[PDB]
Amino acid sequence: TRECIYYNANWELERTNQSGLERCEGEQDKRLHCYASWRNSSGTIELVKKGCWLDDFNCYDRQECVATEENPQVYFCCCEGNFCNERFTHLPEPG
Template identity: 40%
Template sequence: MSVSIVFILILNISWSLSNPKATNYVQPLTTTQCEEYQKECQENCSTTENCTAPEDGKRNHCYVLWEMNANNTPNVHMKGCFLNNEKCFDQERCVSKEHSKMLYCCCEGDYCNKEFFWEPSPTTTTPVAGVESPLICDILANANEYGLVENIKNDDDDDIPTINFKV
């Protein structure tokens, strides 16, 4: 009886190793078509881009380039196919987490760029003494980060700091 159990176990292991669906190996998503959009296009604009077949070892992706308008709705500039960006590998959803004027996302799978999302990551700001407005704090923190601020000092006993910008 124990010989038959060992034989069955060996057969099962052998079958699992020879059958990729039985193991945890995941086949990469293939992208052959993406939704296409060019803001400059006036008429007869295709809504599908057929992606060029990638070279061996490379992968196609879909992308979206957009900005949020004043009403917090997306203003799409471009959609389409592009080739081989590791940040897009295995991304089934097109999601941007950036904090910038122009937003960009990429994904894998046919027409994965039909829907796109902005899910901004939390930001951290450097507090500035005496300044209470979050917008002012963000502006000053960014100016300081990029080396535009010479110094921030408080000469007097009041709560208003002096800020010297590099010119």
């Protein structure tokens, strides 16, 4: 199984909790992940969404949530581990 940090900056209009935990329901073979998404403009971090993330090989064997895209509009990271998406950074690859 898997547990992740949950956050929805749009919680009101979707009628959902703003923050908390999410118990990830998974199938027999499929692996489970956690993800975090945020905006970053003029040094101000704006959270977008956090929660469970289905089987995705981009998140395989990643214990920490690190975004890899060079200057995107909406940053994203995913990881494998319980609550691994609580902290996140932006450390892109060399090239």
